[PDB]
Amino acid sequence: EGNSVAGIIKSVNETSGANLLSSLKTIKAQAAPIYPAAASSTGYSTQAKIALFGALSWILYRADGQSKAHEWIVDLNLNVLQAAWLISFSSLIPFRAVYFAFRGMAPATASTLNGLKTFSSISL
Amino acid sequence: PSQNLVSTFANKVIVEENLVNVAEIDVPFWSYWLSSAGFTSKDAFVKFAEAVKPKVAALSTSDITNLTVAFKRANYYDKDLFTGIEANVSANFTKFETEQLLQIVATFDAFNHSSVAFLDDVADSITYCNHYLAPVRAGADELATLLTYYAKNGHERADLLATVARGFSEVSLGKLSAAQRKDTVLSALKAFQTFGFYPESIEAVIGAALVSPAEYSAEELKEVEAVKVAAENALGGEFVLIQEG
Amino acid sequence: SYSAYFAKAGFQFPAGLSALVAGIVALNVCTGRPTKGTKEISNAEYNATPIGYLQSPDQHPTAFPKVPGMKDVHGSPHHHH
Amino acid sequence: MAVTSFLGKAFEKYFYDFSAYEQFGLNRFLSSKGQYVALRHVGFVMVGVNVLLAANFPFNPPFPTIGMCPAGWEGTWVCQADKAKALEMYKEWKKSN
Amino acid sequence: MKLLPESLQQEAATAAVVASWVLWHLDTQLLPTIMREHKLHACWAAAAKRYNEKLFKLNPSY
Amino acid sequence: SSVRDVKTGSLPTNFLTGVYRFWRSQNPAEKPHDPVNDRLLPAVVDASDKRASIGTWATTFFCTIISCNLLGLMPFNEAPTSGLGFATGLGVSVWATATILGLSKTGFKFPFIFVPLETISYTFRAVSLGVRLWVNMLAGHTLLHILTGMALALPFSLGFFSMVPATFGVCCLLSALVGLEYLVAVLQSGVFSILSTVYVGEFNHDKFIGPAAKIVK
Amino acid sequence: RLLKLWAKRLLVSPELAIVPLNEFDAQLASKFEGISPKYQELLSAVAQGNK
Ligand SMILES: [Zn+2]
């Protein structure tokens, strides 16, 4: 895969003057980058099924031994207390403000890229 | 007859002619590790040097480094192999590292073999295709070998010399024994005056000699003091050793 | 624009998780000691004992016990009391 | 359905715009929404405690009762504070009941 | 309650296996990815003044 | 053999960038007297080769403890750092890492009646770093077990969905203790690894090599 | 060839069509930091695309 500017330079050099201005949208699109198209689902990967069966195999096994733990009704009522905060965190955390607050932790996303200021790289 | 069957098996199955018949698959693996165990064997290495010649143009960069430092340790110089090696380096110069090029050059510096296209593509790769602190991780006995290989061949690349001059400091020369530090300091100052390039880190290879001048002659310290006065007016000042504290 | 490239590869585990799970399991099964509530006996005792008498009552607590301390099995009535 | 694609879209519109804070009115009685969540939380605990107890009610409690008895039991196995005692009384009660 | 474990060495070695996997995973998988996109941004933001001035002096287009 | 592809600017990449750069900031490098140029660059690179990787170690212990502490707040799960050998086994391992670093600063030889009292207060750092993590994860979970037993005594005795102002005031006290446990889960993973940078950073000091010869003016 | 010259420069870099050809070297200076910022911040944002 050669570079697309040498593909632009070649495709503009071997056109004529009459069909130059018509060819400029098919030389533009021949050198556009590939953004791969949204394929069909094929949902829940072979590892997303291990992650959900293995988490269900863990939650059932932990609730099995919680139910015979000599404080079994206190153990099973702590999962209600612990899952009550997972519900209150979905309803109280500002998830767009948290997303943009983690973007400021990283200096790569806290600013814009900064090089190559367009007046230095002209070709007139 | 137990001793007879083992001795008959030993004289027809485990010899060095079948040791080089299993070594035909991957050459630069077996070339490198055997030569590190002390297996020089000049005409067993000729079987290597022709079994690998249809492969040198498509080797990875760690394979090319393994061929040259094996054929350096076995001291065997195949001139039509070593032009396929330098055509691997000068065609894939962006992929080589300074750790790998400083070992390939020291093979090419022993066996006095160079090209102008090779000397540019090694200097283009150390300077531009590699991290600028990769000379600092090198060890100054390998950088002085690279400095003289560019002064033997008369190749002035002033961008490469500013890169290799990073890797000369008190740190890099202090890791050398004083027999090897002396063989490096004289070898680095001889190359720095051949181009007339006196960087600001020449005052660490000069000061590696003037802090212990009892290992040097008066002929070699005349060589050192010739470079010190040549570097003093270039850098615009006078040399002064520092007592620490 | 690249959003549909990242939807193609779905879930994936962390890139060495099979060495964490094989390291935590190999610490929980290579204990070098009997399995927490059991005791190693001779082969002559294991071949002679029913599987209802090899079981201890402490190792089978009741799955949702109506009285705290209910066990599911009762084990050997041949106590050395 | 597609098993990952239906109820993901059903849970999405149960999560987001299904809101019993406004569909059941409920701004008439509650000041903010930050205190509707702060007692839907405590409401989830009180409902979950009362479901876990009632789903198996005749049980001798592992936790210390404070000197209280549930209903007309008061001397049975359900209120007996000695557990080896109440195991004997539960086994007698289970034949009858 | 549960204070001492059945083996203290088994729990100490579970901590050393978990924390050495996190050390391996950070050093090998996370931190190469962190620094590939931290230092694309950082090298471009540090060179931007000297890159553009070196490029201004080079292209003959003015 | 084929690595996965990462989107730039992902949220786990942004979080772990800020986390790593935080713990790296706790033991900053010291400015030399000289200006940093190509003369001083091998002395700066060698100054970094002799510093411990406390930026990496402290975010190893941050991320392995906050993941373990927050498991205790997931339903059906207990925190691994609520175990005595896990939590104190991380505390001794930080203390031994600091000591192995401080013992290598010499030639592995161990350092009148004063020094048994500097040693005791230093050897107690071993157990105090791990027991503070263990007791916090144990004492918060134990209080939650006792108060859930008390708060279950009221609906067991009284009616199900009846006499509800008695159980509402204790279900909101139970709910505010699980909320404090989310704060102690995040704080004790921070206090463990703030202190790991302090203990390991005590022996994180070497001599700047620097220029031994100069050409002044 | 002039039309083909500017065809390549506006297929790669189409934001160049916002600095008019007569007002171009009125922007320059001897250093790159001295270039007039009349079009610098506009050229940087037209270069980032239509979104
Ligand atoms: Zn619990």
Short mmCIF file of N, CA, C and O and ligand atoms in Angstrom, two decimals, chain A residues 66 75 78, chain F residues 141 145, ligand 1:
data_model
loop_
_atom_site.label_atom_id
_atom_site.label_comp_id
_atom_site.label_asym_id
_atom_site.label_seq_id
_atom_site.Cartn_x
_atom_site.Cartn_y
_atom_site.Cartn_z
N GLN A 66 -22.78 -18.67 50.79
CA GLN A 66 -23.31 -17.64 51.67
C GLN A 66 -24.56 -18.10 52.38
O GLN A 66 -24.86 -17.60 53.46
N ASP A 75 -25.63 -12.57 55.77
CA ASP A 75 -24.81 -12.55 54.55
C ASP A 75 -25.66 -12.24 53.33
O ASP A 75 -25.24 -11.46 52.48
N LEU A 78 -26.59 -8.65 53.21
CA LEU A 78 -25.56 -7.69 52.86
C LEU A 78 -25.42 -7.52 51.37
O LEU A 78 -25.03 -6.44 50.93
N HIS F 141 -16.38 -4.12 57.64
CA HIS F 141 -17.27 -5.20 57.26
C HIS F 141 -17.87 -5.89 58.48
O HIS F 141 -18.98 -6.41 58.40
N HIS F 145 -21.90 -6.36 59.62
CA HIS F 145 -22.52 -7.63 59.96
C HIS F 145 -23.30 -7.54 61.26
O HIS F 145 -24.33 -8.20 61.41
ZN ZN H 1 -20.43 -10.69 53.85
#
